[PDB]
UniProtKB/Swiss-Prot annotation, chain B:
Induction: By dioxin. By oxidative stress. Homodimer. Interacts with PDLIM4 isoform 2; this interaction stabilizes PDLIM4 isoform 2 in response to oxidative stress and protects it from ubiquitin-independent degradation by the core 20S proteasome. Interacts with TP73 (via SAM domain); this interaction is NADH-dependent, stabilizes TP73 in response to oxidative stress and protects it from ubiquitin-independent degradation by the 20S proteasome. Interacts with TP53; this interaction is NADH-dependent, stabilizes TP53 in response to oxidative stress and protects it from ubiquitin-independent degradation by the 20S proteasome. It comes from Homo sapiens. It comes from the Eukaryota. PANTHER family: NAD P H OXIDOREDUCTASE-RELATED (PTHR10204), NAD(P)H DEHYDROGENASE [QUINONE] 1 (PTHR10204:SF1). Its cofactor is FAD. This is NAD(P)H dehydrogenase [quinone] 1.
Amino acid sequence: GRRALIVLAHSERTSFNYAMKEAAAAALKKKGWEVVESDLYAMNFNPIISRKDITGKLKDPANFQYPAESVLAYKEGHLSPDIVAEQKKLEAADLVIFQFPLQWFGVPAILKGWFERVFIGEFAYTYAAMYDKGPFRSKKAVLSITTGGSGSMYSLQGIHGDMNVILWPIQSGILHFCGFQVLEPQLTYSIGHTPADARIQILEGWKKRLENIWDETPLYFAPSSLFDLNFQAGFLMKKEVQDEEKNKKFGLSVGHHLGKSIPTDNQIKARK
Amino acid sequence: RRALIVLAHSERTSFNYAMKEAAAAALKKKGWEVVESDLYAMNFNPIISRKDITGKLKDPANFQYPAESVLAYKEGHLSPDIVAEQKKLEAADLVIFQFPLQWFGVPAILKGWFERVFIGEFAYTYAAMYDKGPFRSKKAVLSITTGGSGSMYSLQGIHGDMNVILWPIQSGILHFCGFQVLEPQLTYSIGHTPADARIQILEGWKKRLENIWDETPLYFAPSSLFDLNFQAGFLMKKEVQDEEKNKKFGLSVGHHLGKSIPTDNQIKARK
Ligand SMILES: Cc1cc2nc3c(=O)[nH]c(=O)nc-3n(C[C@H](O)[C@H](O)[C@H](O)COP(=O)(O)OP(=O)(O)OC[C@H]3O[C@@H](n4cnc5c(N)ncnc54)[C@H](O)[C@@H]3O)c2cc1C
Ligand SMILES: Cc1cc2nc3c(=O)[nH]c(=O)nc-3n(C[C@H](O)[C@H](O)[C@H](O)COP(=O)(O)OP(=O)(O)OC[C@H]3O[C@@H](n4cnc5c(N)ncnc54)[C@H](O)[C@@H]3O)c2cc1C
Ligand SMILES: COC1=CC(=O)c2c(c(COc3ccc([N+](=O)[O-])cc3)c(C)n2C)C1=O
Ligand SMILES: COC1=CC(=O)c2c(c(COc3ccc([N+](=O)[O-])cc3)c(C)n2C)C1=O
C-alpha cells in the first residue's frame, strides 16, 4: 500500500511512455496504493523559473536572486500556487516514479523545469541536512527511462559511454541530494526497435516489479557521514575515511570514484 | 570569425549576464562578429511539441518528434523561432553557453533550446555521430557559475567529481553533434566571492577569449575506435579493446572502461 506519485514527461498519450505510466498506475492501485499523477504536458506545466514563482513582494526586487526569494516565499507561504500544488503531491507521496524518454542524455526540459521550480530550498533540501539526511529521506524514487539507442551503445564499450555516468547527475545530484533513497532505474532501451510482443512483456515486467518495489534495496551512494559537512573543511571526506580508502581497489560511486575503478553498475544495480 | 553566445538567465543584473557582456565586448574588440541568444529575453519556448512543425505531419495519429522534426527540417516546415536559431548556429564558428549550474546541469530553458534546435539531419546523423558530426568545424564552450564551492566538486567533495557532471552535456550533446569542446570556464561559489574578485573573474574570462580559438580541445574517444553499426552494436573495435586492456586509465569519463578516469578529462585538455 502507501501513496505513489507518477511524474510523466511525454506529450503523446499514444507513446510507450504513456503506456508505461498507465501500467504503473494499474499495477500499484491493484496492490492497494493510492496513485497520484503529474502528467506535465497534460497539465501544460510551466517549466521556466522566474520571479513570478513568488506571489508576494520580494525581499530585494531590484537584485532578484531565485534561491533566496523562492525559499523565503516557501517559508512565508507565497509561492505560486501551481508550484505549491506539486509540492503537496510530493509531500503526500511515499514512492515517486519519473517516467520519461531520455532526451539529449538527460531528462526532458519540462521535467528539468519541474525540478527547478518544485524542489525549492527548505522544502526539498537543506544545506544543513544534505543527501541521506534530506527532507525526502523517508521516500523512495525511481527513474523509468525509455531510450532510442540500444543497450550496447550505453555499455562500457559503447559509443555513447556508460549509462551509469549519465544517470549520476540525476539520481545523485537531484534525487539523493534531497534525501531520496533511489531505487534501480527501469531502463527500456531502443523502444523504437522493439517487437510488439517484446513491448508487451516490457509493460508486464514493469507491473511485475512494482508489486514488491518498496522492499527493494536502494542504489548505493557514499553516506554523508563520510564527509566534513562544514565550510572551512570544504565538504571533503573526513581525514580518517580518506586514509582507510587508500588501500581499497574500488572507488565508492560514479561521482566518488576517487580516481579509482567505479563499482560495476553503481547507478543501475542496487546490490552494493 | 563569428561567435554565438547563448545565455540562460532571467536577470539582467546577474553575474551570468555580466559574463555574457564581457564575452561580447572581448570578442568584438578582437574583430569577432558577435550574435546573441538571450533565451529569457527572446521569450523562448523550451518545450518540444508538434507545434514545432508548421507543415503537414506525415502521421498525426502517432506523433513521433524525431521523424517529424527531421522531415520538417528537410521540407522547410520548422517553426520560425527554431529556424532563426539554426541559422545563428550555421553561421557561428564559436558557440559560448553561459549559464548558472541548476540541479547539476543546464537550466530547463537551455535544455529545451537543445531539444528544439538540435534537430536530426541538421545537428547530427546516426551515420556521422561525434567526430563526423555537422558541427565538426565549430567549437563550443561552457561558461558555468555555481553556488557550491570548488572543493564540493572535487574527487573528495560531497557532490562528487564535476567531470562526471559535465560529461552528459559536453559529450552527449556538444560532441555528439561534432563540436570540438573547449575547456569549460568554471566559476565556483560566485555568491561568496568578494566584489574585487568578481572583477578579476570577468577580466580573466576576457583575456582567455583573446586566444580561445587556438586552444587545445577536450579529449573524447574518436569514432574510429568503434564499429559504427548495429551488426557490431556500436562497441569498441576488438583490436582497441585488447590494445586498451594494458592501459591504466580509461579513455574518458564516459569510456572509463571500468578503470581509472583520466584526471579532469572533461575540464582540462590532454589527449
Ligand atoms: C529531443 C529528443 C532528444 C533525444 N535524445 C536521445 C538521447 O540522448 N539518447 C537516446 O538514446 N535517445 C534519445 N531520443 C530518443 C527517445 O529517447 C525515444 O524516441 C523515446 O524514448 C521513445 O519513447 P516513446 O514513449 O516516445 O515511444 P514511441 O516512439 O511512441 O514508441 C512506442 C512504440 O511502442 C508502441 N506502443 C505504444 N503504446 C503501446 C502499448 N500500450 N503497448 C504496446 N506497444 C505500444 C508504439 O506504437 C511504438 O512502436 C531523443 C528524442 C527526442 C525527441
Ligand atoms: C533552480 C536552481 C538550481 C540550482 N542548482 C545548483 C546546483 O546543482 N549546484 C550549484 O552549485 N549551484 C546551484 N544553483 C546555484 C546557482 O548556480 C547560483 O545561484 C548561480 O550560479 C549564481 O549566478 P548568478 O549569475 O545568478 O549570479 P548572482 O547571484 O546574481 O550573483 C552575482 C554576484 O555578482 C554581482 N555582480 C553582478 N553583475 C556584476 C558585474 N558586472 N561585475 C561584478 N559583480 C557583479 C552581484 O551583485 C552578486 O553579488 C541553483 C540555483 C537555482 C535557482
Ligand atoms: C528517434 O531516435 C533518436 C532520436 C534522437 O534525437 C536522438 C537519438 C540519439 C541516440 O540514439 C541512437 C540510436 C541509433 C543510432 N544509430 O547509429 O542508428 C544513433 C543514435 C541521440 C543522441 N539523439 C539526439 C535517437 O536515437
Ligand atoms: C544560492 O545557492 C544555491 C542555490 C541552490 O538552489 C542550490 C545550491 C546547491 C549546492 O551549492 C551549495 C553551496 C553552499 C552550501 N552550503 O554549505 O551552505 C550547500 C550547497 C544546490 C544543489 N542547489 C539546489 C546553491 O548553492
